[PDB]
């Protein structure tokens, strides 16, 4: 095996590879862009090279930079991961020119399967089913092939990846619920034939389309010449570290396994945690990861690029992490995955985890009537859970108990609201989701009452520890323990199976504006004369527009419209004007 391997990727897959390299005992080199200088994978590897600026075209896609890092560190092989130079033949040729082993298939295979016109020609010559040219209710099925330079080829099993949003995969399963043990043998042999068609070696995946009406009628769709994002569900059901095998194959060892060593001990499902907001229409989002909890239940696996203090930005794919559940059956695996996503908490970044939980509760998903349109039809009826009084009270109580602890018993600093008469409630105006309301808290953190505007009155007890990441609220006797993180302006809470942020917001003004607040008046700053008018009288202008120019003391005072509106001009060129003389009015 190699002594040093470069991991030419980022995020969860980089961490995933570095983990296997460390277990194999191989010195691991990472690469990072300047945007990832704080990323987890650079700290998990043994050494790391800054390959360039944040833009992918100038970092993880820059072949000369990645090969330069491989040369500099004496990396003997490069594992490409996926999504970058993992299917780039120029990169593999540059590595071969550098004398560095690209961990993957031959450049001829990558070049062949990279165009479906050529791929269909290669595949059909080996007798594999190929689509004649549309399919009713299509099922995305794919087969993990694994191959070596000595002519062994094996299929590890199939997956279903049909839960897709705008062709973005979201939830994936192995095995598929569609196939039976007879037809999956055909799909496996056919995949092995598609691998043997192009002298394939390493891990690869064959994408087939199947009609929901005809499980036994395959058609070839694609060959993907790399490890897939979905590989862990196969890794779970088989017990084969696909990354270790892929390395050993690239090191020139035989597979050291046969088709009789393949087994499927259960069912595995995974879901992709993306930095995207489903209520805002899956718009990619980001920010600092203020705090993190990742589930560690039995049969739960987390593969993740996240750490506290990492920054999520728009330069890359919004994939954050993958939650993988393996159980005895599909329903058990779905329950384990639901429980895990109930424990997964990312603070500081909004994520689809609530949308994942919603999909995992859909009847079609639970009973398995999947199709590649299913998610696109179901998503329009997702709605986020209403902001209950609990979600506001927990933030108000955190702010209040923090202030109470920071007062250190100093009577004037304790937020008691003490009065000679009736005490004043400690009052917070809080915004969360689409709800803005006051919370009024009376008492002390050990025993308090909280009332919410448009809400009820609840008993509260709040258990705040200085510098703790955890804060507990007993609300009407229900104790919930929240992970909490706070900025200058937002409180992020996770607990009770949900995660949200709350903003403390200013009071509304007691007097609303008259529409005159949209109007403005321009007055001469000096006594002088009007030397130009830049705008025709009574015309719409923007707040960038020079409206009147006064000359005084040899200075041209060009006055700019402060607002968008209809500008009315009160003066003509050559008019003498006084200090404060209205020169124009601009009205909404």
């Amino acid at each position: 095996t190699f002594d040093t391997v470069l991991v030419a990727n980022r995020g969860e897959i980089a961490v995933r590879v570095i983990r296997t390299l460390r277990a194999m005992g191989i010195r691991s080199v990472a690469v990072f862009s300047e945007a990832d200088a704080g990323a987890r994978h650079v700290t998990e590897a043994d050494v790391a090279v800054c390959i360039g600026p944040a833009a992918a075209r100038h970092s993880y896609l820059d072949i000369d930079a990645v090969v330069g890092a491989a040369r500099r560190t004496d990396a003997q092989a490069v594992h490409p991961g996926y999504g970058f130079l993992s299917e780039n033949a120029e990169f593999a040729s540059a590595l071969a020119t550098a004398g560095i082993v690209f961990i993957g298939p031959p450049a001829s295979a990558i070049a062949t399967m990279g165009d479906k016109i050529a791929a269909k020609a290669a595949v059909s010559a080996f007798g594999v089913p190929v689509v004649p040219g549309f399919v009713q209710r299509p099922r995305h099925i794919e087969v993990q092939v694994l191959a070596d330079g000595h002519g062994n080829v094996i299929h590890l099993g199939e997956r279903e990846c049909s839960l897709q949003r705008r062709h973005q995969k979201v939830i994936e399963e192995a095995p598929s619920p569609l196939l039976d043990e007879a037809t999956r043998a055909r799909i496996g042999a056919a995949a092995c034939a598609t691998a043997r068609s192009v002298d394939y070696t390493g891990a690869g995946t064959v994408e087939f389309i199947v009609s929901a009406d005809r499980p036994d009628e395959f058609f070839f769709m694609e060959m993907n010449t790399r490890l897939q994002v979905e590989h862990p569900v196969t890794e779970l059901v088989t017990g084969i570290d696909l990354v270790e095998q892929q390395i050993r194959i690239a090191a020139g060892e035989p597979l050291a396994i046969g088709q009789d060593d393949i087994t499927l001990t259960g069912h595995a499902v995974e879901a992709r945690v993306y930095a995207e907001d489903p209520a805002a229409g899956f718009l990619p989002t980001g920010g600092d990861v203020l705090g993190l909890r990742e589930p560690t239940g039995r049969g739960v696996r987390v593969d993740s690029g996240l750490a506290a203090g990492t920054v999520v930005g728009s330069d890359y794919d919004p994939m954050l992490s993958k939650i993988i559940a393996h159980g005895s059956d599909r329903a058990s695996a779905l329950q384990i995955l639901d429980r895990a996503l109930a424990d997964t908490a990312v603070l500081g970044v909004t994520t689809n985890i609530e949308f994942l939980r919603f999909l995992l509760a859909d009847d079609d998903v639970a009973a398995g009537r999947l199709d590649t349109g299913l998610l696109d039809r179901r998503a329009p009826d997702f709605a986020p859970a209403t902001v209950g009084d609990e979600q506001l009270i927990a933030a108000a109580a955190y702010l209040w108990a923090r202030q109470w602890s920071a007062a250190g018993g100093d009577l004037w600093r304790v937020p008691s609201g003490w009065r000679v008469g009736e005490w004043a409630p400690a009052t917070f105006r809080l915004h969360a989701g689409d709800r803005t309301d006051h919370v009024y808290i009376t008492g002390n953190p050990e025993r308090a009452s909280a009332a919410v505007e448009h809400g009820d009155t609840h008993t509260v007890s709040a258990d705040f520890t200085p510098g703790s990441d955890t804060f507990a609220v007993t609300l009407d006797g229900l104790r919930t323990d929240y992970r909490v993180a706070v900025t200058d302006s937002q409180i992020w809470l996770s607990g009770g199976g949900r995660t949200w942020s709350v903003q403390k917001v200013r009071e509304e003004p007691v007097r609303p504006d008259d529409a005159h607040s949209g109007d403005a008046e321009l007055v001469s700053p000096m006594p002088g004369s009007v030397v130009a008018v830049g705008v025709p009288d009574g015309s719409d202008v923007t707040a960038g527009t020079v409206v009147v120019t006064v000359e005084a003391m040899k200075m041209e005072h060009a006055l700019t419209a402060p607002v968008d509106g209809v500008a009315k001009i009160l003066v003509a060129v050559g008019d003498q004007v006084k200090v404060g003389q209205p020169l124009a009015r601009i009205t909404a």
Binding site: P525, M526, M553, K554, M555, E556, H557
Partner: protein, 510 residues
């Protein structure tokens, strides 16, 4: 406006780099070849590792004395030594042997004035050949001539402001009082020599021939005369001993105001190049400057709707509170009464004042004089002159006539004053002077008017230029606009080290 500011700052930094070298390379070579540190390496070697150094008037005497006297032959400024900000004054022995020109005297006195007003220890790195005899009537005898240096040493010593000298080379005539008047004097063995009359005078008066080492060498003074208190093996040993001396002085006083944690500004300070015109004839809103230099962009404006050609308000810079007073047009009577009221607030709140000058003058005409604009200006001048809080001034644009006086120009003892390189300073603007004199000339042809105006414009441009100002110590330096926030922040930490006098005003002409 960015490119014009970038060209002016490139000129500034080129001039600073040229002055920082000191004398000719032949003199630098001869200095190092005698085993000495260069004067600037003496200063850098005295500071704590990585300390800032706020140099006083690095371009002093620029364009004077045929430019034979870079920096006036002196390095002066504030640096941290052994945990305290000290005023360091060092003779640049590579410039004319460290001869005191008239501007060298003035620079030394200004460094002592900064030390007196801020209670800073003084360190003198003495290496000077004496007075420039062709101009001795400007080096000697007046109140602010070379004898005042020792008056400053004694009275500061009476206040307990430590006076420390290191004699690193020649120290002759009246200059022999720089070590001898200091509280504690270091001398380098086989380099430093102190005598009230040197070998040429001993020969002329007595016929005796002596070397400068025989007459007043370091061994003589440290072993036999007692004029000096420490004998150092070399310049580095002298600087080490001076650092040990400063470590005995104890700490500085805490500021009389509350200092909060500093908050970053909302903007890159080179955005100042975008918002300020180099041409003083182009108006702009000075809020564009203020919101960029203050912490968090937070600025609480006082009387925002009234007297709007003067902007006044509270902010923080590097956590220090400041009352900013900034010109935003011509001064009216309303602006002057606003300024006076704001200064009274800052005085009672113990808040230091920052003046941002860009002032052409007061509003002219019969109705303004009848309104008593002079009486309102006098109220602002009284408030400025009598304010007991520290005052800092940055000239960001024009600084003309009575507007200079109303905005805490040099006559009002701002604790420091600096210029931006676009600034101008004169009793009038050049175009005002040209227009008023052409108006007294009366009617003349435009080709005759331009020929009349050209010499006046040339005069006021030559004398008003920032380098003409700094060469004469009318300011403490030309600074890059983008450094303004840092310079004021450094100065705010200095000026808190003196206690406040009580509030006291002259009669306000109501």
């Amino acid at each position: 406006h960015r490119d014009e500011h970038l060209a002016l700052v490139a000129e500034l930094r080129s001039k600073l780099a040229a002055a920082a070298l000191g004398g000719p390379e032949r003199a630098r070579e001869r200095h190092v070849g005698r085993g000495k540190l260069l004067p600037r390496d003496r200063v850098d070697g005295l500071l704590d590792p990585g300390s800032p150094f706020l140099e006083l008037a690095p371009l002093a005497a620029g364009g004077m004395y045929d430019d034979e006297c870079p920096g006036a032959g002196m390095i002066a400024g504030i640096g941290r030594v052994s945990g305290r900000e000290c005023v360091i004054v060092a003779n640049d022995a590579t410039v004319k042997g460290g001869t005191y020109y008239p501007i060298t005297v003035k620079k030394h006195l200004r460094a002592q004035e900064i030390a007196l007003q801020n209670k800073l220890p003084c360190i003198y790195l003495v290496d000077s050949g004496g007075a420039f005899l062709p101009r001795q009537d400007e080096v000697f005898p007046d109140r602010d001539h070379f004898g005042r240096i020792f008056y400053n040493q004694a009275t500061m010593s009476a206040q307990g402001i430590a006076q420390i000298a290191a004699v690193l080379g020649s120290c002759t005539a009246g200059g022999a009082y720089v070590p001898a008047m200091s509280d504690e004097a270091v001398i380098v063995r086989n380099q430093g020599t102190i005598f009230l009359g040197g070998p040429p005078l001993v020969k002329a008066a007595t016929g005796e021939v002596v070397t400068a080492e025989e007459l007043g060498g370091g061994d003589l003074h440290s072993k036999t005369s007692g004029v000096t208190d420490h004998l150092a093996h070399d310049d580095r040993d002298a600087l080490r001993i001076v650092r040990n001396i400063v470590a005995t002085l104890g700490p500085a006083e805490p500021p009389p105001w509350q200092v909060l944690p500093a908050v970053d500004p909302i903007a890159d300070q080179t955005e100042l190049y975008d918002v300020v015109p180099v041409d003083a004839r182009v108006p702009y809103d000075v809020h564009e400057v203020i919101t960029r230099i203050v912490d968090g962009g937070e600025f609480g404006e006082f009387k925002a709707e009234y007297g709007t050609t003067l902007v006044t308000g509270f902010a923080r810079i590097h956590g220090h509170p400041v009352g900013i007073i900034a010109n935003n047009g011509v001064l009216f009577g309303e602006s002057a009464v606003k300024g006076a009221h704001f200064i009274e607030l800052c005085d009672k709140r113990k808040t230091p004042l920052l003046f941002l000058q860009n002032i052409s003058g007061f509003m002219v005409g019969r109705d303004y004089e009848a309104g008593g604009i002079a009486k309102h200006g006098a109220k602002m001048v009284t408030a400025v002159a009598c304010a007991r809080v520290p005052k800092l001034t940055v000239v960001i644009g024009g600084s003309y006539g009575a507007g200079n006086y109303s905005m805490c120009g040099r006559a009002y003892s701002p604790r420091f004053l600096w210029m931006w390189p676009n600034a101008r300073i004169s009793v009038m603007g050049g175009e005002q002077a040209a227009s008023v004199l052409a108006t007294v000339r009366g009617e003349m042809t435009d080709a005759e008017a331009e020929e009349f105006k050209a010499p006046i414009r040339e005069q006021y441009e030559h004398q008003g230029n920032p380098y003409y100002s700094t060469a004469r110590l009318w300011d403490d330096g030309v600074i890059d606009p983008a450094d303004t926030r840092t310079v004021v922040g450094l100065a705010l930490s200095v000026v808190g080290q003196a206690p406040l006098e009580p509030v006291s005003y002259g009669v306000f002409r109501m």
